[PDB]
Design a protein around this ligand. Structure first.
Ligand SMILES: NC1CCN(C(=O)C2CC2)CC1
Length: 109
């Protein structure tokens, strides 16, 4: 299936992203205990667990929707954290890896 093909390819890309050694900050929703005013500042939180559930719920009917959610993980991180923080550094490493996986899979809209 074109729908099941898309699902299979996204599932593979998302699982590879999640397994990456730089993914650890992004694995689950940001915890207030670690960032008490986070949710006062970041209006569209996103994380890889939430993406995994969205994928399982057949939300990602296009490349565009999947890219927007992963890209939001990164933009939240860079909005919130200084550039020389480990979080920012992880974001840019994981983004490079993400793009290489999108390209390796031939994913197009
Ligand atoms: N003290 C940190 C805790 C984790 N935060 C994040 O932005 C991580 C990257 C997702 C908020 C600030």
């Amino acid at each position: 299936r074109d729908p099941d093909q898309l699902y299979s390819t996204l599932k593979s890309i998302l699982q590879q992203v999640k397994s990456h050694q730089s993914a650890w900050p992004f694995m689950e929703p940001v915890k207030r205990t670690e960032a008490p005013g986070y949710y006062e500042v970041i209006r569209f939180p996103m994380d890889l667990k939430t993406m995994s559930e969205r994928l399982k719920n057949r939300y990602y009917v296009s490349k565009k929707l999947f890219m927007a959610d992963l890209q939001r993980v990164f933009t939240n991180c860079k909005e919130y954290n200084p550039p020389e923080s480990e979080y920012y550094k992880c974001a840019n490493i994981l983004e490079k890896f993400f793009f290489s996986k999108i390209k390796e899979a031939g994913l197009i809209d």
